[PDB]
């Protein structure tokens with residue numbers, strides 16, 4: 001055994017020992033209990049970043065821990081290969097997106113294997129291969145004939161200079177983010193998942209997830225946005241029916257979730273596309289411009305509530321069906337056409353958004369709810385204005401005194417008796433649009449025939465192979481400029497027909513890949529029925545918070561779709577969900593000659609502790625703020641150079657010890673040094689132990705007769721084993737478990753283990769400490785364990801807790817004052833010469 005810890009020699013050898021033993025290549029074996037630990041598969045973007053290392057080390061600690069406890073552990077790995085980054089690099093470096101992708105995969109695979117992750121590489125998938133996306137094209141055709149997938153005209157943003165579609169997040173003040181040209185709203189036919197048909201199922205099944213973060217379940221409930229309200233119809237006054245047709249000339253219909261406050265409606269609001277808005281804007285140019293500004297907007301829903309609410313009066317009036325008040329109709333920019341009826345009622349006294357709107361335009365406010373004896377200020381909003389559980393109605397005629405639920409049913413009675421309203425349930429959830437005007441994506445298995453219509457590709461002709469021999473230029477999606485691809489024959493009549501040139505949303509690949517890992521080479525379906533029954537569902541899911549809404553909801557939607565098709569037997573894909581925090585770093589720059597800043601990568605800097613300067617230039621730079629690692633402010637720390645400088649075990653240990661997994665991790669140069677020096681200490685601790693006698697049989701059994709010092713070390717040992725096991729399986733806080741093993745080595749250093757019984761307790765401490773640290777630093781623990789014990793580490797198993805070593809030794813004693821029944825005198829005074837051991841006597 002070498003005296004000094006050199007990871008470059010022990011990490012490759014330990015990896016071959018694991019690959020030769022094939023301990024990570026697991027099977028559907030009904031002998032050992034299964035465990036499915038899954039980390040979110042990455043985009044093959046070129047190199048791994050620190051966010052990748054943290055996410056996949058967390059998954060590996062959980063996997064190696066469950067494996068050491070006797071589980072059949074599947075930790076698969078794959079690549080989310082479809083996406084825009086491949087097209088952008090294709091335009092930049094003049095290469096094919098497929099070629100650019102496959103070289104990033106084979107390089108990032110070498111980085112992952114160097115870190116020593118226990119990954120079953122015989123289950124590796126790649127979403128850009130036809131052997132994978134053929135099955136989401138297959139599920140597309142099935143759900144398309146059922147109507148779950150349907151084709152419908154939709155509105156998108158078209159950049160007339162970059163010649164492509166842009167999402168709302170890529171539009172800035174009406175212009176494209178790159179071209180800077182005004183975008184055009186276009187109505188094009190697209191495809192949709194009918195996810196609204198599963199809204200009640202996706203909402204209620206969140207209650208089954210007793211091991212999900214409560215905030216993730218909360219965010220999904222708000223996104224679905226179920227609401228039980230009331231449809232209300234306000235009759236249009238006779239002086240306002242000009243230019244209206246159909247039922248719009250008879251009434252204005254709205255939806256509200258608080259019909260108990262219908263007596264407090266001071267005005268109504270309609271969307272810019274509403275017929276009442278169109279009839280009012282016929283001769284007033286101020287309304288025409290307001291409608292045009294609303295249509296030209298591109299507010300993303302992540303910022304929809306943060307936009308300034310604006311409105312214009314129409315001069316038209318409707319009648320409240322309960323008190324007969326004439327309410328003026330306004331055109332509001334926050335009312336979205338297609339969300340319900342496209343028209344709402346406003347109660348400024350009990351809705352904060354209506355309060356700020358009325359305060360802006362000096363609109364009336366009518367209090368109709370009261371909570372206790374609280375004062376109602378018409379010029380200041382209070383939190384109790386919108387309370388529902390502890391309020392009673394006021395200023396509502398024959399509705400005064402009713403609470404929320406009784407007034408709700410009372411209002412429904414009057415509305416239904418008049419035929420002016422009825423209860424209705426609504427959902428904020430929209431359908432899922434999957435059409436993408438991109439090249440590097442899964443083709444949509446639709447063929448357009450002038451006689452048969454939109455025809456799905458039959459199952460025999462799947463997949464519709466995307467040609468990998470394309471280099472996009474940037475002047476339109478290449479699939480539309482390639483007749484050799486879209487010119488085809490109709491699979492129904494054989495006539496001339498064209499293929500769909502739009503590709504699928506890349507979220508479709510990530511929505512079911514966790515099932516494909518169970519049988520990645522299965523060629524007769526999405527997932528083999530035998531492997532789906534064995535693995536069931538993912539036991540542990542690890543990923544970032546940015547996928548808590550869209551990706552997680554899509555994965556649950558696909559799981560219920562595949563369940564209703566007969567492929568799987570679970571309602572939910574993920575049992576446990578761990579949300580890893582981001583990784584941040586310090587930013588550096590220099591001042592530009594034009595009044596700006598040019599950012600510098602931290603690796604190209606060196607600090608004096610005081611100021612900082614370049615590594616080779618000696619030009620003093622300026623240190624800036626700390627934020628998430630990104631190429632924006634050029635603060636990304638390459639983990640490969642970290643592996644080159646310290647090895648894989650130091651990188652894994654630093655990220656597991658710097659902060660808890662949910663908390664953000666700040667990069668620290670001195671932090672990775674403390675991780676490396678601790679691994680040097682652990683190596684020296686085992687070396688110096690074997691240097692004075694060698695290995696012995698670790699202590700086991702009855703500990704009676706051991707010294708007080710050695711008994712205290714065994715107590716600390718089995719306390720650490722119980723503390724680490726609870727930190728891995730339950731708390732999932734890996735930084736606290738590292739310090740627990742560190743404190744065990746502290747007491748070991750302070751304990752004389754030179755005796756014959758001392759050597760045995762020392763062996764028991766070290767054999768457990770290397771197994772307690774194996775999930776975090778498997779390379780050095782594998783090497784050190786083979787020096788202490790000759791058995792295979794994974795067959796020795798997770799350290800067992802000896803509960804006898806935790807029980808303290810008691811000394812029963814009798815206490816008689818004056819004959820009748822230093823620490824013993826203290827307890828016998830909490831009840832004077834004492835005979836040592838059995839008698840204490842209180843000199844009365």
Ligand SMILES: CC(C)C[C@H](N)C(=O)NS(=O)(=O)OC[C@H]1OC[C@@H](CCCn2cc(CN)nn2)[C@H](O)[C@@H]1O
Pocket residue numbers: 040041042043049050051052055080510542543544545546547551581582583584628629630
């Ligand atoms: C299931 C799919 C939708 C996953 C998708 N292919 C994806 O997000 N792929 S990815 O390659 O983008 O991320 C792979 C995984 O591991 C890294 C995590 C951290 C990302 C944020 N971050 C970055 C830093 C410092 N550079 N600190 N935090 C990430 O959330 C994810 O869990």
Ligand SMILES: [Mg+2]
Pocket residue numbers: 208210
């Ligand atoms: Mg349960």
Ligand SMILES: [Zn+2]
Pocket residue numbers: 449450451452453490491492493494495497
């Ligand atoms: Zn046809």
